[PDB]
């Protein structure tokens, strides 16, 4: 009935994982498959007081403890099968002709995602449906659209990232917030932050929500505030205590804190759909300002872009403004941050894709369009890893089962802009394949890609800022 979608999704994730991973055939430093294999090799062979010190120049440890524990567990379960994979300094750059160790990892990612990402999202759509009396098919379609999101399905199965876990823990947090277990939503978010630290792009919203719900909105409830402030601290302490007691002491806490949050080197040296990749080609910030000034202006710029939403929640917290304020905050962090990368649009895409359960058609059209644009801004990354066939197959299937081949917001100024964005996409996959760069601007198509995505992201961002204020007017919670 409705369990064949949950199986077709896993078969899709399995078949997308027959293409080359990030870094195949690259001797000196392989891709992100080799980083993860190295962590699985390093955690189970060194004491807990050398994980963040061991070898910082060959794929050191960049993520908080929970990632280390995850890698330790998988490394044990995998060094059971074949030990010569995760050997210390011997099996460095391990590539097998049989394609062993390329199936074990591709299956560990599938398992971790099945555990930490499918139930969260499925229960979210179920709660929404049952609360709004959505036809079982109405829930099943909104739940199939959320599981075939191409950007994540290609950045995990095909590039080998463990992002489904970091996003599923945050979906658990949002579910707890819905069911009104705040003391446990605090804990699930503190876990989601300790897997990958790029989940701090929601803290400005979770904090305001919990605070206004505890001490401001209904009453000045001082017990709930204590329960939340103790859940947070107990979870932080239980996750960081193994580094302290079994590690070295405060030295280990300091080294981990500075491995997670590293200093910035360079100035706008990567091509992102940022506010700075797009204006650094006219203003040439490298020739006008210093790096201190740019690191200060980016902070002011991101804090001024998430303040209006943080305050709208902290002053009017409700359960129908959560997706929009989450978008308003995370996309603000993505557009104006000093150092952003091609990925990290998955963080703004979690709340976005969550809006595939809305009832309107303008909302669903904007959602599908921004998903296509988000996938499109990842072609330069998925083109140097192979993945030409998987990119196209996912790009086609996702749009097909939605109904995008049988569709736009309602206006003359919306349909035209959306069709123009599509026409300027379909003209980059023709200046990229056939016609050669001008030979005097070596990377001119990559810049058209950094630039044609920023416009769409910064229009969707303002659309969300509009929905926050036009809605939130004693609005439904059924819309």
């Amino acid at each position, epitope marked *: 009935p409705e369990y064949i979608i949950f199986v077709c999704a896993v078969i899709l994730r399995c078949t997308i994982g027959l293409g080359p991973y990030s870094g195949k055939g690259s001797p000196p430093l392989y891709g992100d498959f080799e980083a993860q294999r190295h962590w699985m090799e390093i955690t189970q062979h060194l004491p807990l007081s050398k994980w963040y*010190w061991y070898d*910082l*120049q060959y794929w*050191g440890l960049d993520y908080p403890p929970l990632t280390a524990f995850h890698s330790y567990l998988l490394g044990l379960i995998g060094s059971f099968f074949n030990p010569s994979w995760f050997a210390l300094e011997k099996s460095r750059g391990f590539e097998s002709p049989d394609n062993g160790l390329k199936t074990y990892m591709r299956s560990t990612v599938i398992i971790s995602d099945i555990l930490f990402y499918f139930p969260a999202v499925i229960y979210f759509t179920k709660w929404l449906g049952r609360y709004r009396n959505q036809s079982p098919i109405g829930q099943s379609i909104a739940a199939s659209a959320i599981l075939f999101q191409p950007s994540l399905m290609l950045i995990d199965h095909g590039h080998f990232q463990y992002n489904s876990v970091m996003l599923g823990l945050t979906a658990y947090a949002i579910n707890n917030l819905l069911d009104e277990y705040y003391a446990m939503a605090a804990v699930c978010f503190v876990l989601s932050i300790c897997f990958k630290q790029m989940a701090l792009y929601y803290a400005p919203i979770f904090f305001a929500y919990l605070l206004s719900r505890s001490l401001l909105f209904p009453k000045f409830n001082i017990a709930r505030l204590t329960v939340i402030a103790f859940a947070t601290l107990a979870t932080f302490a239980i996750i960081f205590a193994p580094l302290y007691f079994l590690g070295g002491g405060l*030295k280990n806490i*300091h*080294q981990c804190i*500075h*491995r997670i949050f*590293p*200093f*910035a*080197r*360079g*100035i706008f040296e990567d091509k992102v759909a940022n506010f700075w990749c797009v204006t650094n080609v006219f203003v040439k910030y*490298k*020739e006008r300002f*210093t*790096i*201190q*000034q740019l*690191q*200060l202006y980016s*902070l002011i710029a991101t804090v001024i872009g998430f303040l209006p939403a943080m305050i709208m929640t902290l002053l009017h917290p409700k359960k129908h403004l959560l997706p929009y304020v989450l978008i308003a905050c995370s996309m603000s962090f993505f557009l104006f941050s000093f150092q952003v990368h091609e990925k990290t649009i998955l963080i703004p895409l979690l709340p976005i894709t969550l809006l595939y359960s809305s009832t309107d058609w303008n909302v669903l059209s904007l959602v599908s369009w921004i998903n296509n644009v988000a996938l499109f801004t990842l072609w330069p990354l998925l083109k140097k890893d192979g993945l030409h066939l998987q990119y196209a197959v996912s790009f086609l299937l996702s749009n097909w089962l939605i109904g995008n081949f049988s569709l736009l917001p309602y206006n003359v100024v919306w349909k035209s802009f959306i069709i123009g964005t599509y026409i300027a996409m379909g003209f980059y996959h023709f200046l990229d394949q056939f016609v050669a760069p001008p030979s005097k601007y070596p990377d001119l198509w990559v810049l058209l890609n950094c630039a044609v995505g920023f416009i769409c992201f910064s229009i969707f961002w303002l659309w969300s800022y509009y929905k926050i204020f036009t809605s939130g007017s004693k609005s439904m919670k059924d819309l």
Partner: antibody, heavy 122, light 110 residues
Framework: VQLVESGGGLVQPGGSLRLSCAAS????????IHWVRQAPGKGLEWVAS????????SYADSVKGRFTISADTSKNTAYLQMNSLRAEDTAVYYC????????????????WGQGTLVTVSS | DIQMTQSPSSLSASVGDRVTITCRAS??????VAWYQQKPGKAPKLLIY???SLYSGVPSRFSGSRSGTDFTLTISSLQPEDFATYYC???????????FGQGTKVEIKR
């Protein structure tokens, strides 16, 4: 808080040397050590770096491919290894610690060592 | 790729004069410019950092400043314990090399 150099003297042109810099009063796993030489009758010159929060090294092209700098993090020590030792290397070597912070705000080379003399000659 | 042009290499002054040393970088990509002093034979001593912030324990008469790429060190009252060599120094970020100026030997006049 005081650094101390050790190890340096008459070495034939072509030999090698291991300069040690013992730290005392602060942790070198957070201070981004630098080495800096002053030649006899010249101006202060920079040779090699080490960051120690990510182990990013960096050298002066004069001494690239011949020097190797590292830091023993447990015992709070820094080491420089000179291998080819051209004759244009006699100098007074200092180890200096520079403390950086968030948002690219540094505090300068506030702690110097009294320097040790290298005489690459014959 | 990263250099500092100190100006000049030699200038005389009497006990009490006001002194100013300039130092210009091939590109203004970081205001992390520190000013060090060195007596003959001893190790340098940090006078100013961040190009304007005075160290702790340094006299009050030392003031730095920046104008684009023309950093400057000002001694508003040159006292008898101020004749030495003075170096600028610029650094871009952590994993990057640094560079010292050439040296401005201040001496007494007669």
């Amino acid at each position: 808080v005081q650094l101390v150099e050790s190890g340096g003297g008459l070495v034939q042109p072509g030999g090698s040397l291991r300069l040690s810099c013992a730290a005392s009063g602060f942790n070198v796993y957070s201070s981004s050590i630098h080495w800096v030489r002053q030649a006899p009758g010249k101006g202060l010159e920079w040779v090699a770096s080490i960051s120690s929060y990510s182990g990013y090294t960096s050298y002066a092209d004069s001494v690239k491919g011949r020097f190797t700098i590292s830091a023993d993090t447990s015992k709070n020590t820094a080491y420089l290894q000179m291998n080819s030792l051209r004759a244009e290397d006699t100098a007074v070597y200092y180890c200096a610690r520079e403390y950086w912070s968030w948002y690219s705000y540094s505090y300068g080379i506030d702690y110097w060592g009294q320097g040790t003399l290298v005489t690459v000659s014959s | 790729d990263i250099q500092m042009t100190q100006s000049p290499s030699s200038l005389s002054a009497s006990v009490g004069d006001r002194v100013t040393i300039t130092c210009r970088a091939s590109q203004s990509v970081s205001s992390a410019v520190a000013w060090y002093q060195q007596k003959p034979g001893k190790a340098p001593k940090l006078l100013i950092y961040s190009a304007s912030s005075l160290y702790s324990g340094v006299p009050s008469r030392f003031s730095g400043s920046r104008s684009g790429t023309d950093f400057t060190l000002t001694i508003s009252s040159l006292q008898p314990e101020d004749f030495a060599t003075y170096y600028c120094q610029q650094s871009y970020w952590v994993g990057y090399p640094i560079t010292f100026g050439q040296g401005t030997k201040v001496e007494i006049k007669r």
